[PDB]
């Protein structure tokens, strides 16, 4: 669930 | 690690 | 409609 | 899940 | 220089 | 690490 | 312009 | 025209 | 180092 | 066929 | 400029 | 056969 | 155009 948080979150990055 | 970069990332929010 | 709160908070980030 | 990231995002509020 | 790298990339996250 | 998350977030450019 | 090129490559980053 | 040539080159960078 | 970090963006390019 | 010539000599730049 | 950038993404091509 | 020659003539197109 | 553009990859071939 990190991870997924993680991608949502630096996607635009 | 994860919660750090989570913190930072979530920190204006 | 938590997703759509979320989605708000996490606007910035 | 979606609770707990709320409650955290929410702290300032 | 690492983290300065890191820091632009994330600005938008 | 600081090159693992660099590599990731320049993956598309 | 080596900050202009990489500002452009970085631009989806 | 070098610019159109220098984009689709680019595009993946 | 700009030159390092375009020779890495550019190498599949 | 001229641009699918090209594509195919650039594909790799 | 244009052609020099053009000439170093060529290289391979 | 003609493909497989131009493949290996355009190698370092 | 695309004819100077193929001379020149193609030199090599
Ligand atoms: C979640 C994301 C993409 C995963 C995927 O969908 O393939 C991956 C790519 C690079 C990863 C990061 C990098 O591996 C560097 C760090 C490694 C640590 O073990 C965790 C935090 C750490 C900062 C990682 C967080 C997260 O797992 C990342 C950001
Ligand atoms: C990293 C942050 C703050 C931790 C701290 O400052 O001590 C904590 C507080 C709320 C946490 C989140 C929430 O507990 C809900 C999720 C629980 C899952 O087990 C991991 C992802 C999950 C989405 C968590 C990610 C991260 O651990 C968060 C964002
Ligand atoms: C609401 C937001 C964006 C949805 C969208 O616009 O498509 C989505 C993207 C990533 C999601 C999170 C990630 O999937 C990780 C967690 C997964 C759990 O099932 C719920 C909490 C959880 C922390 C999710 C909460 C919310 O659904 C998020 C934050
Ligand atoms: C998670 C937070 C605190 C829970 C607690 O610790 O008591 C609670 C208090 C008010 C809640 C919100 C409010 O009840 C209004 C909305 C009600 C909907 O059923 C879900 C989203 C909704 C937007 C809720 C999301 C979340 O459950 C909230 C924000
Ligand atoms: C550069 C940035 C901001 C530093 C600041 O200006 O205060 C900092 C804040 C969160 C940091 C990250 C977190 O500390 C978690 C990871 C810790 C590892 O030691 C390096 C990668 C790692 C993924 C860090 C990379 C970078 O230094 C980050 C992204
Ligand atoms: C992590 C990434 C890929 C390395 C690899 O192929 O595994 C490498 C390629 C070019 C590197 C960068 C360039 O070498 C230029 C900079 C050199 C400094 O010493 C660190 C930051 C600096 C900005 C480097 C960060 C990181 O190590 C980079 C981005
Ligand atoms: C060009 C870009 C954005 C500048 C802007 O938009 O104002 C800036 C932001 C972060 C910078 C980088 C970081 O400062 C880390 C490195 C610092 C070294 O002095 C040059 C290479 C180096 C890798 C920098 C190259 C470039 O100037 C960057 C990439
Ligand atoms: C063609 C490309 C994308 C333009 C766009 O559509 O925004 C642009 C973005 C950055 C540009 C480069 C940078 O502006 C730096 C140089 C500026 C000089 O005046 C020309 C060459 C030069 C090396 C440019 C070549 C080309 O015009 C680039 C690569
Ligand atoms: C770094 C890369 C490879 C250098 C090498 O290893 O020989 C070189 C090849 C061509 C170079 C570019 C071209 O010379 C065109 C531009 C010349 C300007 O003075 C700097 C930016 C400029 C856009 C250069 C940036 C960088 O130095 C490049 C991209
Ligand atoms: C064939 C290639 C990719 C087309 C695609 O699938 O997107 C395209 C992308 C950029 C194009 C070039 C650019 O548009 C610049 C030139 C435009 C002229 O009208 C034809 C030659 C010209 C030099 C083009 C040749 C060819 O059509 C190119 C090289
Ligand atoms: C830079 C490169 C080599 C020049 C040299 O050998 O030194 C030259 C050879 C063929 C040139 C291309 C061909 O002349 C076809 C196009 C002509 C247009 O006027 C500019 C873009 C255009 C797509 C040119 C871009 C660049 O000047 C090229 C790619
Ligand atoms: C053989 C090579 C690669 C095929 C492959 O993917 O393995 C292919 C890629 C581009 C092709 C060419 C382009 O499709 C353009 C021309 C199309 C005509 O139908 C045949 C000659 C023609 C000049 C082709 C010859 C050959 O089949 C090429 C050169
Ligand atoms: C430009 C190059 C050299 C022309 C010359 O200066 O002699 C010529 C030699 C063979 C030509 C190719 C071959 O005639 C086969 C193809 C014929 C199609 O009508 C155009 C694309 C086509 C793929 C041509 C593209 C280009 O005009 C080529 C590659």
Do not use: V
Not at 1 to 13: C, G, H, I, T, V
């Amino acid at each position: 669930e990190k991870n997924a948080l993680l991608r949502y979150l630096l996607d635009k990055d």
